[PDB]
Amino acid sequence: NSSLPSLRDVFANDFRIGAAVNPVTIEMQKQLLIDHVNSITAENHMKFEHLQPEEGKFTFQEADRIVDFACSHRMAVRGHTLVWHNQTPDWVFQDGQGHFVSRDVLLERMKCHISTVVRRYKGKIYCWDVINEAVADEGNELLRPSKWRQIIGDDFMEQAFLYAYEADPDALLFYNDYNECFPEKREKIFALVKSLRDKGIPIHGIGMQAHWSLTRPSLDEIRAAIERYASLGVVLHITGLDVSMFEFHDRRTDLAAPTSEMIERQAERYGQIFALFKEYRDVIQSVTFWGIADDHTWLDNFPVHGRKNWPLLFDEQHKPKPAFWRAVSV
Ligand SMILES: O[C@@H]1[C@@H](O)[C@H](O[C@@H]2CO[C@@H](O[C@@H]3CO[C@@H](O[C@@H]4CO[C@H](F)[C@H](O)[C@H]4O)[C@H](O)[C@H]3O)[C@H](O)[C@H]2O)OC[C@H]1O
């Protein structure tokens, strides 16, 4: 209640504090957001499928509500996300006869979408995840396969950044990805961003999703990743932080509540993480959780459909967890 510290105040001098929302959860969690965050991200309603579900049909209504909420409460907004292998409708890659479109056609659709979306929120949204998760998560290759990449070629990302920059040259443009602290994938992300910067491409930041577990990645791997990326001269945002109660191999569905030890280790893990972020306050400018309280989290159904997870600083009744007290006292 009254005597609880406010996350954004606690970290006033370190970084912004954000949360991913939709219009429902804005209503359901309004007070937590008003009390703690100074930054908002749309969990789903600014991805391609929720902005242009059919060609020439733009559905900005839900995204507008999110932006209106943020502006009415002095909160910044991160835009998420323009170009991604997921949650993009099929029409984008097809012609009238069901076949794939050409390089030049896909570029015009990319440019048209990026221009329409970014111009609408120009001067309200201060940064954009332009490219999401383009690096390969496994294997020897640099890049994931995607229809973006297959149709256009490997320079589809340079084009995306240049289209966004032209639509709003005052925005900070980000490459955004997960498993960003595993060394092999860290070096791919580093190598990709380095090459883009070395060509003069307007990429200003790296977004570290940080969909983490109690164990992985280690504090040393997080520190190395921060330093490797920060050495490129880019801004760093932590963009989707949560601390899952299950490791990747742990696919149990029948846990009705977190254990005493899970709750305690999570508190400790969050304390170590925010200590590391504070230490690197000079390169980390924002820390956004993918949610805010345990009554809404995508981890309830990912990677295991139909279970429950407890990944955030507040519980389902919106009360501070022990993780809260450790996080604010670094
Ligand atoms: O409602 C959900 C919505 O919340 C969700 O948003 C995206 C979630 O995060 C990002 O996408 C996922 C990142 O994590 C990957 O999974 C990893 C698999 O490999 C590891 F082992 C690791 O432990 C996992 O974290 C997923 O494959 C990605 O899709 C995006 O940036 C968000 O937009 O997604 C859509 C809605 O259903």
216: left (phi over 0), alpha (psi -120 to 50) or beta: beta
* Nearest-10 Cα torsion for 260, 303, 173, 83: -170
Closest ligand 1 atom to the C-alpha of 47? 33
Q: Which of 252, 225, 220, 251 is nearest to 236 (CA)?
A: 225
Q: What is the rounded CA–CA span in Å between residue 128 and residue 145?
A: 22
Tell me the C-alpha distance between 58 and 41, whole Å.
Answer: 19
Among 264, 177, 270, 268, which residue's Cα sits nearest to residue 229?
177
User: Are 15 and 277 in contact, with CB atoms under 8 Å apart?
Assistant: yes
Q: Resolution, in Å, please?
A: 2.4
CB 168, CB 118: distance < 8 Å? yes
Q: What's at 203, amino acid-wise?
A: I
| Domains of the chain by residue range | 7-327
Pocket test for ligand 1, best of 22, 128, 211, 247 (most atoms within 8 A of CB): 211
Ligand 1 centre to CA of 98 (Å) is 29
Residue with tokens 């099929």: 90
Q: Is the CB of 146 under 6 A from ligand 1?
A: no
Residue 326 has, within 13 A of its CA and on its CB side, a CA count of 19
**244 within ligand 1 shell (Cβ under 6 A):** no
CATH 3.20.20.80 fits 7-327, yes or no: yes
- For tokens 């600014």, the residue is 46
Nearest protein CA to atom 21 of ligand 1, as residue: 248
Identify the helix (H) or strand (E) that includes residue 237. Answer: strand 235-244
Residues contacting residue 323 through CB under 8 Å, at least 6 positions apart? 243, 263, 266, 267, 269, 270, 271, 312, 313
Is 22 close to ligand 1, i.e. is its CB under 6 Å away?
Answer: no
> Of all atoms in ligand 1, which is nearest to the CA of residue 43?
4
Distance from C-alpha of 226 to C-alpha of 232, rounded to nearest angstrom:
10
CA distance 203 to 282: 19
Closest CA to 246 of 324, 296, 301: 301
- Shortest CA distance to 42 belongs to which of 8, 68, 79, 15? 79
- Asked whether the beta carbons of 160 and 131 are under 8 A apart, the reply is yes
Alpha carbon separation from 110 to 113, 305, 311 (Å, rounded): 5, 32, 35
Q: Residue 56: which region, alpha, beta or left (left: phi > 0; alpha: psi -120 to 50)?
A: left
